[PDB]
């Protein structure tokens, strides 16, 4: 790989620079190189990896939705035939999105998850696995769609099981996992009641544990609790 000749520490340094420059594709490429060195990632390094790919795929998802909406409108009654170009370009964006997802899933499978023994690392990686299968599910229309959805569910569920055993209810990773799994239920699994129940129970159990926290931990936890509340407000 093109980053094989660069020192691990230099890749991490450059990922941080790329983040400051809002160069998320470069950030992701640097972090992929760092992962491929084969050593486990620290907390900060796991966060860099996640931020980089979240921003790259986030932009691809936004573009895919714009193009999909145009394509859907083209297929309404009374819409003039404009040829294959909208489908082709939506497909191009879709294929690039799928590529990025497959790259992340590949890093997780070779070999981040299998080496992650602490709850904080293992839950984080399993949540990412769920997230990138969820993005694949958003664009899936074929024979494998159910298996893709189930892959996301399974990863999220394993993460949830560990998180509930090993982490306090205010832990930001536990909270972020629950946030995202709740969105999976609402948007992917056609399970809005499960989505709402998960968000509410997660919020409420977190609330009850805030008293244990420092000011700084309180700030971290309450930020994600507000995201849960924001989703609940959207859904109820």
């Amino acid at each position: 790989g093109a980053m094989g000749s660069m020192e691990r520490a230099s890749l991490i340094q450059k990922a941080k620079l790329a983040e400051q420059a809002e160069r998320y594709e470069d950030m992701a490429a640097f972090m992929k190189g760092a992962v491929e060195k084969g050593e486990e990632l620290s907390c900060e390094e796991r966060n860099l990896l996640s931020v980089a790919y979240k921003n790259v795929v986030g932009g691809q998802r936004a573009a895919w939705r714009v193009l999909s909406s145009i394509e859907q409108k083209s297929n309404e009654e009374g819409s003039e035939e404009k040829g294959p170009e909208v489908r082709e370009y939506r497909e191009k964006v879709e294929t690039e999105l799928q590529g990025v997802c497959d790259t992340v899933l590949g890093l997780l499978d070779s070999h981040l998850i299998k080496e992650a023994g602490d709850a904080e690392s293992r839950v984080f990686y399993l949540k990412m696995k769920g997230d990138y299968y969820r993005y694949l599910a958003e664009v899936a229309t074929g024979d494998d769609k159910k298996r893709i959805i189930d892959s996301a569910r399974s990863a999220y569920q394993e993460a949830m099981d560990i998180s509930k055993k090993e982490m306090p209810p205010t832990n930001p990773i536990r909270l972020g996992l629950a946030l995202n799994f709740s969105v999976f239920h609402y948007e992917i699994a056609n399970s809005p009641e499960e989505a709402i129940s998960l968000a509410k129970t997660t919020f409420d159990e977190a609330m009850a544990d805030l008293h244990t926290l420092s000011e700084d931990s309180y700030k971290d936890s309450t930020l994600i609790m507000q995201l849960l509340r924001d989703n609940l407000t959207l859904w109820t």
Partner: peptide, 5 residues
Amino acid sequence: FPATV
């Protein structure tokens, strides 16, 4: 769209 992290 809903919030995710």
